[model samples]
Target chain A: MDVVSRLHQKYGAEVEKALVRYLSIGLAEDFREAVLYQVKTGGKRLRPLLTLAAAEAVSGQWRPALPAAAIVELIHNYSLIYDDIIDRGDVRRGLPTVRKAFGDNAAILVGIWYREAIEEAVLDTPKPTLFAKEVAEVIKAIDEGERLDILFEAAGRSDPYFVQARWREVTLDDYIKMVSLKTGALIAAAAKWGVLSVSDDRGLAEAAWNFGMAAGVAFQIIDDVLDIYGEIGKDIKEHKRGNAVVAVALSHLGEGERRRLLEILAREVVEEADVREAVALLDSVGAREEALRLAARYREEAERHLAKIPNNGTLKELLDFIVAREYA
Target chain B: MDVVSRLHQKYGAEVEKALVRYLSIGLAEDFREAVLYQVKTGGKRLRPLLTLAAAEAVSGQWRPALPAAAIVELIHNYSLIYDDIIDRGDVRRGLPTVRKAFGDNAAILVGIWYREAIEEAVLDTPKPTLFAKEVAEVIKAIDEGERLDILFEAAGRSDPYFVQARWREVTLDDYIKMVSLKTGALIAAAAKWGVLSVSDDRGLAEAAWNFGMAAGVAFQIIDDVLDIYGEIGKDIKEHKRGNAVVAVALSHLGEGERRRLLEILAREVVEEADVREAVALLDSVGAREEALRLAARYREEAERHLAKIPNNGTLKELLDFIVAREYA
Candidate 1:
C-alpha cells in the first residue's frame, strides 16, 4: 500500500479509539458528541499520519508518537471547529458544521473540551512538563494567526481601494506570514513532537521543524487556490476571500483588468457571476501559474530541510507526499 | 489584622505579581492591556486564601500552594470575565467590565488567554502530572456548572410559571450543584492539592475535600444572601440570582408575593425599588430566616469536617475564619 493507504489502514482506528477514550470523561458528553460528529465527517487524516510516519522513519516504532499524533489531530480539529464558528461557515466535507448541528455555544464549549483533552493526552506522556510548554507555544501561534485573519477581514471590508490601496490590505506577504503562523506552526510542532518521541536529538527535531514549516506553507498555498476552484465553495461560503490567488493574479494584470476585479469584490451584492468574472480575470492574468510557482519554491525549501534528516525513509516519503499531493 | 486586611496584604501582592508576570508574555498588545485591566480590578481573594489556608491548616507549607492559588484565581477571574460578557453587565467592582471597557470579542479572547495562562501555571508546577487529572476534572466541572446555569436561565424564561409554581424548584438544586461544581470543586481541589503537597495521605486529602466542599456551600449561601441584600449590586447587575438563597426566598413567599417577584424578574429591569421590594418580601415571609437556617446548617456541617483534624493552630484559626466570615 502507498503511504496514504497504509496510514488510513493503521492509524485510522487508533485515532478513532483515542478520541473515544478521551471523550468518555463524564463531564464531556455533549462536547464528545460534537467532536465525534466532526471527526466522523472525515478529512485527509494527513496530520496524524505525518506524526506517526515521522516517528517510524526515525526509530522504527510509532507507538510513542501515537499520543502526539492524537494531540495534533485534536488541536487541528479544535481550530477547525472554532474557525467555522468565527467564519460562520455552514458546511464541512459536505456535511453540516458542528455549530450548525449543535448550537454555537455548544460548539465553542466542545472546542474547549477538545483542547483540554489534547493537553491531558500530552500530560500522560513522558516528560510532560517540557512537552506542555512546547504545546502551549504552538497553541499561542495558532491564536495569533486567527487574530491576524480576523484583522485582515476587518481591514479588507473597510478599505475601499483595499486591493489597489494597500494601506493595510492583506498582501501576498501577509498571506504567507498568516498561513505560516496559522497552519505551519502546528504542523511543524507535530512533526518535531514525533522526532522528539524516540530520540532526544535536538538537531533532528529542529530539522523536522524546518521541514514541516516549509511543507505547511506549501500546503496552505494550494489550499488558497482550491478555495476558489475546489469542488465545494468552502472559502466563499465562509465569506473569506477565495481570491487570494486572484490577488496574486491581479498583481500581474493591467490596471484596467485589476480595477475591474476590485470593483467586483467591492460590490454590495457579489453574485456567482462576479466570482466567475474574478476567476476568469485570474486565469487571464496567470495568477494560478504564479501561485504554483510560489508553492514550488516552498516545496523545494521543505525538501532541503528534509534532506538534513540523518535517516529519511518513510518520513521522506511522507514529506514528498505532503508537497506533491496538491498536484495529484 | 482583620480577614480582609490580611487578604489585602497577602493576596493583593500575589495577584499583582501574577498580573505583572502574565503581562510580560508576548501577547498581542491589546490582549495584554485588557488582561491587566481585568486583573487590576479588585476581587475578593477568598478562593486563593482558602487554598493557602487549607494548606497551612494541614501542616503543609503555604509556598507550594501559591502556584495552585494563582491558577485557581486565574480560573475564577476568567469565568467572571466571560460571565460578564454573557450577562452584558456594564460594571465590575464599580469599574467598567472587561467587555464594556474592551469589546466582547476581546474580552472572550482575554478569557481564553487567561485560561491558557492558568494551564501554564499548573504545568509549570513540579509534579504537574500528579495533579493534572484532578485539575482537568475541576475545569470540566466548572464548564458543566456554567452549562447548567445557562439551562436554568433558558428554562426560567421559557416557562416561568411552570418554573415558578413548583414548591421547590429544581433550579435551586441546580444552583447548589452549580456552586459546588463551580466554586466548591475548585476549593476542594485546591485544599486537596495542599494536602497532597504535604504528605500525599489519601485520608487527609479526603478530609480536606469534605471540609472544602461543605465550607464552599456555606460560602456560596452567604454570597447569595448578600446578592439580595449586600451593599454590592454585582449579582443583580449581572442578572444572576444570588443562587439558592434568592430562589428559596421566592419559593417560600405567598402566591401574591411570589407573583410580584416573578413580575419584577420577568421585566428584567432591576431598579432600586425592585431590590427593596424583593428584600421586603424575603423579610416579611421569613425567607431570610429560612436562608439563615440553611446557612447555619451547612456551617455546622463544615465544622463537623473541621473537627476531624486532631491537631491545629493557625490552620484552625483560618478554618474558623472561613466558617465565621459569612456571619461577620
Candidate 2:
C-alpha cells in the first residue's frame, strides 16, 4: 500500500538521472529547466505510480509501463503549464510559474515542447499506431476541455453557484459533466491504456475506465474541499469561479444567508473572520456533509469496479491507499 | 515560362477554394465580411502558385502538395494580418484590415487560428513525423527572423541601405550564410520536403536544398527592389518593415541627399513628390543598380544549382522559371 516507496524501489534515483540527460537539448533548455523546477518541487506522482503499480499488478514487472508512466507525467505537467498561463497564476508549487519566470511566449513554447516530447515517447513505444492515437485523443480532449473552461470564464458564469441557481437550475449533473470531461477523461484514459498495454481482455480496459472515472470524480471533490479548508495560500480573489466548495455551500444556504455570502464574496478581500463564518454556515447548512457523501459514493462505485477484477493483490491495495491518502 | 498559366492549370481554383474555407475558420461573420471586403478584391496568388508549381515540377501531380501549399499561403496571410495590426494599416489588398473590421483580440485570435490550421494540415499528412519536424523548423526560422527584424526596427537602424551596406561589408561567403538562414530556410524546406517525400535520395535532397536556397535569396532581393521601385500603389510603406526600398535608395545617396531622404522618412506621411524625389536620388546614387546586380547574382547561383540536377523534367523547368522571373 506504500505506493511512493514501491515506486522508489522500482525506478528510484536512476529515472531522475535519466531525466537530467533527456532534458539537455539546446532548443529545449528553458523548457527543461521549467519542467525540472516543477518536478523537483514535487507532487504525489499518483497517476504515474498507478500506471507502474497497475502494470506490476498484472505482469509483476514495471518496465513495460515505464514509458506510459513517464508520458502521462509529461502530459500532466504540460497541462499544468498551460493552465497556469490561462489562469494567470503567478506561482506554481511555491515558485514562479513558467509564464511568470520566463514570460508567456516562452511558456507557450515550453508547453509545445512537452507535447512534442509526449509524441516522441509514443513513437518509441511498441504498437506505435495505438499509442499515437491515444496521445492524439488525450491532446484533443485536453484542448477541448480548456476551451470550454475559457468559454465559461469569458461569459462570467464560471461559478458553480451561478450555474446552479439559474432559471433552469443547472444542478449537480451539469457540474459533474464538466468535471468528468475536464479531469476524469484523462485519468480514465491513463488507466485504460495501462490495462490495454498488458492484456488482450477488453473487459479489463472497461473496468479500468470505470474505476478511473469514479476516482477522478472523487479527486475533484476532494480538491474543492482543499481549496477552501486546506492551508494552501491561494489567492481566491483572482479565482473567477472562487471555490467550488463555497459554491456548494451557497447552494445549501437559505436566501438571507446566500445574500450575506454573496456580499462577503463581492468584497476585494474576505477576512479570516469571514472565512470562519462561511465555514460555520457551510457546516450548518450540511454542504460539507453533502460533498463528503458524494465523494464516498464515488469511492464505493470505484471499488465495485475494482472488485470485478480477479486479482486480490498489492496494486488494488495501493489504489485503495491512494484514495484514502489523497483525501485525508 | 508561362508560370502563371501553369499555376492556374494546377492550383488556381484550389487555392481560391482553400482560402474561402480558411477565411471561415479564421474570421468571425462580421470580420469575415470585412476581410472579404478586401481579400476578395484579389491579388495574384504568387507565393502559393510558386509552391504548387514547385511541387508539380517534381511530382507531375499537385494534389499531394495542396495542403503544404495552402499552409504556406495561410502563413503568409497570418503574417499579413498581424503586420497590419502592428502597422495600424487600414486596408489590405484594398479591403479593411481585420483589426479595423473587428477588434485587436479578434484579429490576434484569427491569426492564431490560421497558424493552428497550418499545423493541423501538416499533422494530417501520412508521414506526420517528417512533416511536423519540417514545419517546426520552418516556424522556428520564421520566428527567429521576425525577432531579429523587430530588434532592428526597435533600434531604428532597419533601413534597406544599412542592410545592403552590411552585406557588402561582409565577405560574400558570410553574406550568403546570413541571407540564406534569414530568408531562404523556409522556402528551401518547402522545396526539399517535396523532393524528400518522393526520392529519399540524399544527393537529390541536397540538390533540392541548394536550389531552394538560391531561389529564396533571389526572391528576397526582388522583394527589396519592388519595395523601392515597384508601382506607386504597391509602395513599401504598405509593409510593416516600411519602404525598405527608400532605405536602400538613401544608402546610395550623397551625405546631403541621404539627410534629405531621412527627413522625408521621419515625416508622418510621405507624399508622392517625396517618393519621386527619393527615386531620383536612389537612381543618381546607383542603389537601384546595386540591388539589381545582387538579385542577378543570386539568380545565377540558383540557376547553377538547377543545372546540376540530373532530371530534365517539369520540376527542373519550374525551378528555372522561378530563377528567371526574380530578375525579370
Candidate 3:
C-alpha cells in the first residue's frame, strides 16, 4: 500500500464510525435507512481523511476533529444527493443513484435530512460559532459554484429564469473560478476545519484553506479527465461544458475542432457513442496529458501553501496521492 | 386596520429592505432574478414580522433583530421553494410556483441558494452560535415534520425507501407532532430569535420559544382550515392526510364516512368535485369550526406562555393576529 493508503487505513475506520454515529443520531428510524445509504455507497472518504490529516498536522491528534470531519462529509454527501437529482442520474459509484432507488421526492427529502445532519454535527464540535461561520461561508461559495456551473451548461443558456445578458462563454479562468467554489470550497473548508477543530489561529486556518483550495482544483481537473477517459464518467453524458477537460480542449483546439466538440456536448441528447467520440476528440488534442500537467502545477501550488504550515511529510504525500489517484 | 396590521406597517418596510439587501448580496446577477422571485410572489411576510415583534417584546427595539428576522424569513422561503418542487405545486400566492416558472432544476438550485442566504443571514446576527444552533434544531424538527407528513401520505406509506412497519396511521397526536415541526418550528424560531438577538437569557429565550411554538401550531391549524374552506386550498389536491381537518374528521366521523373521506384522499387522482366532496364531508362534521376552536385553544396556550414574559400588549396582539388572520 502507498503511504496515503496507509494513512487512510490508520484513520478511515474512526472517521467512518464517527460518520455513522453522528448521522444515526436523531434520524427517524424509517428514513435513517435512506439517509445512511449515501455513506454506504462507496466514496474515498478523502475529504474527512484530509480533515483528520490536517488536524494531525496541527495538533498531533485526529479525534478532536472527528465531529468536524463528519460535518464536512455530511455536507459533501448532501451535495451529491442533490447533484444526482438535478442531473437526473440513475447510477452512482456502480450502484443505483439515491434518486433512482428512492424516487425524487424521497431523494429530495433525504437531502434535506442530510442538511439537518450537517448542522447537528456542527454543534458537536468545540468551536461551534467559528466552525458554523466557516461552514456558512463554504456552503455559500459552493452554492455560487453550482449556480455558475448550471448557467454555463447548454441548457442554462436558454433557461428563461436566468437572464440572457449575463450568460458566460466559460473560459479557463471561468472554469477555475467555478471549480474553486463547487469543488474547492468544501475541500478548503475540510482542511481549514483541521485548524478550526483544534485551534483558533486564523492564520493557520487560512494556510490550510489555501493549500486545500489549490489541491481541490487539481482534484477536480483530474476528475474531469477521469469522466472522459476512466472506467466511470458522467460529465459528457450530462452535456456539461463546465468541465476542465472540455474547457482545456476548447481553449487549445482549433476553431473547427472546438466547434465540433461543442456541437457534440450541446446535443439535446448525448448518446454513449457521442461520449466516446468526444473522448476521442479530447484524446487527439492530448487534453488528458495537458490537464494532468495543469493538475501537477496545482499540486505544486498546494505544496507551497503546505510549506507555510508546520512540517508534515504525510500532508505532502497526501496531496500527491490525491492528484494521482485513479478511479477504482 | 388592526393592531397587528398597524404593527406590520410600523416595521414592515425595514424587514422587507433587510430581506432584499441580504438576498441580493453575493447572488449572481444572472440567477438573482430567479432567486428573488419567491419573495416577490408575496406571502404575508409574517414570519419576519413575528421575529421583529418577538425582539420588541424583549428588547423594545426591533432594529437589533433585523438580521435575525431576515434569517428566519430566508429559511421559511427556502423551505417553500423546496416544498413547491417536491409537491409538484404549480401555483403559490396566485402566481406560478418557482418550480413551475423557473423549471424544477432552476427551482432546486434557487432553494440551495436560499439556504446559503439563510447561513449568511445567520452570520449577520449578533449571536451566531446561539441563533445558528437554534436554526439548526428548528430545521431538524421541520425535517421530521415534513417526513411525518410525507409518510402519512398514501404515497409515503408505500415508498420503498421508507420501511412499511414504521408507517404512521395518522392520529390527532401524530398530526400535532407533525404540524409542530412542519409549521411551528420556524415560527417558534422566529420568536426565539427575538430573545436570542438582544439577550442570551436562557429563561427568556425558552419563554419566547414556548409562546411561539403554541402560536405556530395555532397558525398551521388555521392554515388547514383555510385550505379547505377559504379562498384557496391545496391539502385535498395533494392528497395529504397530515392536516388538522383531515385528522379531526377521521377522528369524529363514522367508519363509512371516514373511509369515504380516506378513499377520496387516496384516489389515483382527485378532481375539483372530489375536493368539494371532501370539503362537504369536513363541513358536515363542522371540522372548520372545531379546527378553529383548536387553533384558539393553542392561541390561549400561547398566551399562557406569554404571561411568563414581561407584560406586553403588542406581543399579545401579534399572537392574536397570527391566529386570526385570513387569506386575502
Q: Indicate whether candidate 2 or candidate 3 has the larger TM-score.
A: 3
Q: How do the residues A1-328 of candidate 3 rate in per-residue lDDT, one tens digit apiece? A: 8766787789888888887887776787777778888999888888888888899888898899999999999889888899898778899999998988887877888887777678778888988766776776787788788878886776424445543433457788998999999998888888999878887788989999999999899999988887777654478776778888888888878888888888887787887888888888887888878888888888889988899888567788788777664431
Candidate 1's residue-wise lDDT over A1-328, tens digit each?
8778878897788867776566556644434555577778888888888887788778888888878888788888887887776556789999988877775555655665776777777776655776777777787778767666655442233212222222245567777787888889988987888888887888888989989999998888887878778844334433343235855865677889977766665566667877777778878977877888888899889888888776677776777677676462
Which pairs in model 2 have colliding backbones?
B38-B95, B57-B315
The Cα RMSD of model 1 versus the native structure comes to: 5.4
Q: Model 1 off-target regions past 4 Å?
A: A28-35, A154-173, A229-287, A308-317, A324-328, B52-64, B154-175, B193-208, B227-242, B246-288, B304-328
Q: Please report, as a residue range, the 10-residue window in candidate 3 chain B with the lowest summed lDDT.
A: B156-165
- In the predicted model 1, the residue pairs found to clash are none
TM-score of each: 0.81, 0.67, 0.91
Error of 1 at B61 (Å): 6.2
CA lDDT, every model vs. true structure: 0.69, 0.58, 0.81
- By summed lDDT, the worst window of 10 consecutive residues in model 2 chain B runs over B161-170
Which candidate number maximizes TM-score? Answer: 3
Predictions ranked by TM-score, top down? Answer: 3, 1, 2
The per-model DockQ list reads 0.24, 0.11, 0.52
- Cα deviation at A65, candidate 3, in Å, is 1.1
Candidate 3: CAPRI quality band: medium
Runs of candidate 2 exceeding 4 Å displacement = A12-44, A64-66, A154-171, A193-210, A231-236, A242-285, A304-328, B1-51, B67-123, B132-183, B195-210, B220-298, B304-328
| Tens-digit lDDT track of model 1 for B188-297 | 77667766665566887788777777777777777677666676443443345435656686667788987776666544567777767766766787766676677677
